[PDB]
A paper describes a structure:
Ryanodine receptors (RyR) are >2-MDa membrane proteins that allow for the release of Ca2+ from the ER and SR, thus mediating a range of Ca2+-dependent processes. Each forms homotetrameric assemblies of ~5000 residue long subunits. Mutations in RyR1, the skeletal muscle isoform, can cause malignant hyperthermia (MH), central core disease (CCD), and other myopathies. Here, a collection of cryoEM structures provides insights into the molecular consequences of MHrelated RyR mutation R615C, and how apoCaM opens RyR1.
With the expected functionality of the R615C mutation confirmed, we solved cryo-EM structures of wild-type and R615C pRyR1, under nominally Ca2+-free conditions (5 mM EGTA), in the presence of FKBP12.6, which was used as a bait protein for purification. Despite identical experimental conditions, the overall R615C pRyR1 resolution is lower than for WT, potentially indicating a larger inherent heterogeneity. Superposing the N-terminal solenoid (Nsol) shows that loss of interactions mediated by Arg615 leads to pivoting movements of the neighboring solenoid regions (Bsol, Jsol) relative to Nsol. Locally, this results in shifts ~2–3 Å in the Bsol region near residue Glu2175, but due to the pivoting movement this is amplified further away from the mutation site, e.g., up to ~10 Å in the Bsol region around residue 2457. The N-terminal disease hot spot domains (NTD-A and NTD-B), located around the central 4-fold symmetry axis, are no longer forming inter-subunit interactions with the N-terminal domains of neighboring subunits, as observed for WT RyR1. The overall result is a widening of the cytosolic cap, with the corner regions moving downward toward the SR membrane. Corresponding movements in the Jsol region cause a splaying of the C-terminal region, which is directly linked to the S6 inner helices of the pore domain. As a result, the pore is considerably widened, consistent with an open channel based on the position of the S6 helices. However, for R615C pRyR1, the main conformation of the Bsol region without apoCaM bound is different from either of the two conformations with apoCaM. Instead, it can be best described as a conformation that is ‘intermediate’ between the two when considering the degree of bending of the Bsol region.
Numbering used by the authors: 1 to 9, 13 to 106
Amino acid sequence: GVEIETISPRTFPKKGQTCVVHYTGMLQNGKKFDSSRDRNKPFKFRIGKQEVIKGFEEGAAQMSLGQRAKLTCTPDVAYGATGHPGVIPPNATLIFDVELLNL
């Protein structure tokens, strides 16, 4: 049930290539469990490395250069039964506002 809602919008990410993006997480209650903008550090990851949750990768695969979108991820594709102890509660969704700013 993954959905992508474009926020203020064609360069699709290549397979096995790194893409930097400043993403922000949000829960239904309203608490910020992570914030890349507050850390002031650009996050980098690889698609083929499979080091990130499947929901974030699936949302970034459909994104484009210079465009942000609320990537609503399914509970199973990201922390299905358990996640980080104390950060994400079990049986809960995870909304990531990915803002792809790759080169």
